[PDB]
Amino acid sequence: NNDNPLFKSAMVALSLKISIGNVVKTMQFEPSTMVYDACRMIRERIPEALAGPPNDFGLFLSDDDPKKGIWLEAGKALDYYMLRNGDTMEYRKKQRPLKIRMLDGTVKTIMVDDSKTVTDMLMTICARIGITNHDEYSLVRELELNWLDHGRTLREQGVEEHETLLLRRKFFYSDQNVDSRDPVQLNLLYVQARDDILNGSHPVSFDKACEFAGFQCQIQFGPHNEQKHKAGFLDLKDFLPKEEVKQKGERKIFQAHKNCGQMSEIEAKVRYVKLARSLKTYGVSFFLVKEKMKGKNKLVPRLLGITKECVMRVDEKTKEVIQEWSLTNIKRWAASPKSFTLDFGDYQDGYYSVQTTEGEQIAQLIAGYIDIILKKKK
């Protein structure tokens, strides 16, 4: 009855659904068309494609799993991306707002290039707020699960466009100085040290935790009063690390509280910070790993600590430092999604190989600290 002059064989042309907001139009493309030229063709056919300067827009191949969506490169041909008839591409603004929690706790929205890695977005953030040394910072989620691989994209790590991230200064021993003369700065150091102890990222023995809590009582309640500060008074979850919340700790806390005497709030904060910094565990990033002991088939949980100068094994119950290796004496390291391994060359016999789901975190920390020592050499 009638033939169609528009028809091209399914094999010689690509038929793609182009989406812009709620608008969707099916368009036909020669498969060798460069992404840059396909955008021009879209601008000629979809009026909502003209909603801004032409080079502000690009092509995004979406997926039902958002972690698999990808931006197309402007110099590539469409058929490089293995597209087939019926696939859906988004004509999409290349920059997008990223909400970042600033160092003063407020949230600032920052336009970033949505096709880039977390490192690239961190650099854009630091540029906007005047931070030249972006290597002193990183982005983390605020839901462990919060770590982000800065060599990968937010998207492939499950971070969608709605989520606010935290700009976080890395730990520096040089960022600290205990002076009762600056009360505001003393309080920030106190709250940082206290929160690390209470949330267990600074692992301490049960005896030490009750000592810290004794200073905490002086700070929060003033000198000990045996009428008010009696058995049952304390909400022990606010004074002891999660894993160490035990009724038998209260009597020890009150003794440490009593031993403060009439110590002032300022002086108790100084002493809290000093006690924390006096521990070998202070400032160390710890990972709970599982070790294989000779002569036991059940693996042994152990705390593995990474610092700027060494790697350290710490007993999980007593928090005693069992063993230390200097970063200088590590020959190589390896990480998989389930394990982490250290090779010490001829410094010892056998590798140190542990089960953990945070091996990549550990490896990047070691690699980071090793580069710093190198950059300080040349």
Swiss-Prot record:
Region described as Interaction with LAYN: spans on this chain: 254-378
Coiled-coil positions: none
Positions of the FERM domain: 96-377
Subcellular location: Cell projection, Ruffle membrane; Cytoplasm, Cytoskeleton; Cell surface; Cell junction, Focal adhesion
Ranges annotated as spanning the membrane: none
Disulfide topology: none
Subunit relationships: Part of a complex composed of THSD1, PTK2/FAK1, TLN1 and VCL. Interacts with THSD1; this promotes interaction with PTK2/FAK1 and VCL. Interacts with NRAP and LAYN. Interacts with SYNM. Interacts with ITGB1; the interaction is prevented by competitive binding of ITGB1BP1. Binds with high affinity to VCL and with low affinity to integrins. Interacts with APBB1IP; this inhibits VCL binding. Interacts with PTK2/FAK1. Interacts with PIP5K1C. Interacts with F-actin. Interacts with SVEP1.
Record's comment describing the protein's domains: Consists of an N-terminal FERM domain linked via a short unstructured region to a large flexible C-terminal rod which contains 13 amphipathic helical bundles (R1-R13). The rod begins with a five-helix bundle (R1) followed by three four-helix bundles (R2-R4). These are followed by a series of eight five-helix bundles (R5-R7 and R9-R13) in which the N- and C-termini are positioned at opposite ends of the bundle, creating a linear chain. The four-helix bundle R8 does not disrupt the chain because it is inserted into a loop in the R7 five-helix bundle.
Function: High molecular weight cytoskeletal protein concentrated at regions of cell-matrix and cell-cell contacts. Involved in connections of major cytoskeletal structures to the plasma membrane. With KANK1 co-organize the assembly of cortical microtubule stabilizing complexes (CMSCs) positioned to control microtubule-actin crosstalk at focal adhesions (FAs) rims.
Protein's recorded name: Talin-1
Species whose genome carries this gene: Mus musculus (Mouse)
Gene (UniProt): Tln1
Whole sequence portion shown: 1 to 404 of 2541
